[PDB]
Design a protein around this nucleic acid. Structure first.
Ligand SMILES: CN[C@@H]1[C@H](O)[C@H](NC)[C@H]2O[C@@]3(O)C(=O)C[C@@H](C)O[C@H]3O[C@@H]2[C@H]1O
Length: 157
RNA sequence: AAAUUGAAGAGUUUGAUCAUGGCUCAGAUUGAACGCUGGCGGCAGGCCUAACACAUGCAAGUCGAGCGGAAA
C-alpha cells in the first residue's frame, strides 16, 4: 500500500563567496491508511531528488497510531516547537476538518473523520511533528483498561 | 424517538532559517448604496440622514330607544 503525500517544497539558500547555492527541501508523509504514518524531510539541489529522499526517509520512520475505525478514540493535543495541534474524534461523514499539513498527515494515517485546530506556528515541518506527537499519544480503550487493570466496560462504567 | 453532527488556514520581515509579531486574504451577514445587467412568480422588506419645514386631502366619532326640536 503506502499512500505518499508531499506536504511542502521550499527553496532554501546557503550564501557563498560566489553568490548563493540554492537547494530544495521536501516535506513528505507516508502511511498505509490504517494506523501507520511517517514523515520524511529530504534536501537536494533538485526538487525530485528532495522528494525522493523525503519519501525514503518517511518509509523508515513510520509509526503505529491507534485509530477508531477512521477516527480518534479521544481528543489529543500535540506540541512541537511553537506549533500546537488539537484533534478531536468526530462522527462519520464529518470529513477531515484539519488545516494544512495536518490534513495530509491525517489522510495517509487513515483518519477520515476528525475535528482539528492548529494553534501557534503553522509551519508545516513543526505541525507535522506535533500532529504525529499527538497521534502517538492516543490509546485505545483496551490499552487504557490494560494499564489500569480494569475492563473496557469498567473504564466506561 | 428527536430537540443535533462540532473547531481548516494562507500571504507578507530573511541570502536562507526558526520563532515572535503586526498587516492582509478566503466565510457568513445587511433596512444597504453604487456600477453593469435584468424575465416571471410567491413571501417578506422599504427615510438608517433633518425629533428639518411642511401645501392639499384624509387618520374620531357615534347615539333620535337621553332631550327640545325640524334645517333638510
Ligand atoms: C586564490 N584562488 C581562489 C581560491 O582557490 C578560492 N578558494 C579559497 C576559490 O574559491 C572559489 O572556488 C569559490 O568557490 C568562490 C569563487 C568566487 O571563487 C572560486 O575561485 C577561488 C580562487 O580564485
Amino acid at each position: 500500500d503506502l499512500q505518499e503525500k508531499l506536504i511542502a517544497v521550499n527553496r532554501v539558500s546557503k550564501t557563498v563567496k560566489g553568490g548563493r547555492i540554492m537547494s530544495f527541501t521536501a516535506l513528505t508523509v507516508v502511511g498505509d491508511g490504517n494506523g501507520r504514518v511517517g514523515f520524511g524531510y529530504g534536501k537536494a539541489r533538485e526538487v525530485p531528488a528532495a522528494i525522493q529522499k523525503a519519501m525514503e526517509k518517511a518509509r523508515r520512520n513510520m509509526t503505529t497510531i491507534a485509530l477508531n475505525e477512521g477516527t480518534l478514540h479521544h481528543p489529543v493535543k500535540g506540541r512541537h516547537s511553537g506549533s500546537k495541534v488539537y484533534m478531536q474524534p468526530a462522527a462519520e461523514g464529518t470529513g477531515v476538518i484539519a488545516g494544512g499539513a495536518m490534513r495530509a498527515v491525517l489522510e495517509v494515517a487513515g483518519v477520515h473523520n476528525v475535528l482539528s485546530k492548529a494553534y501557534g506556528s503553522t509551519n508545516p515541518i513543526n505541525i507535522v511533528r506535533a500532529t504525529i506527537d499527538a497521534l502517538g499519544s492516543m490509546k485505545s480503550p483496551e490499552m487504557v483498561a490494560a494499564k489500569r487493570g480494569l475492563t473496557v466496560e469498567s473504564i466506561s462504567e
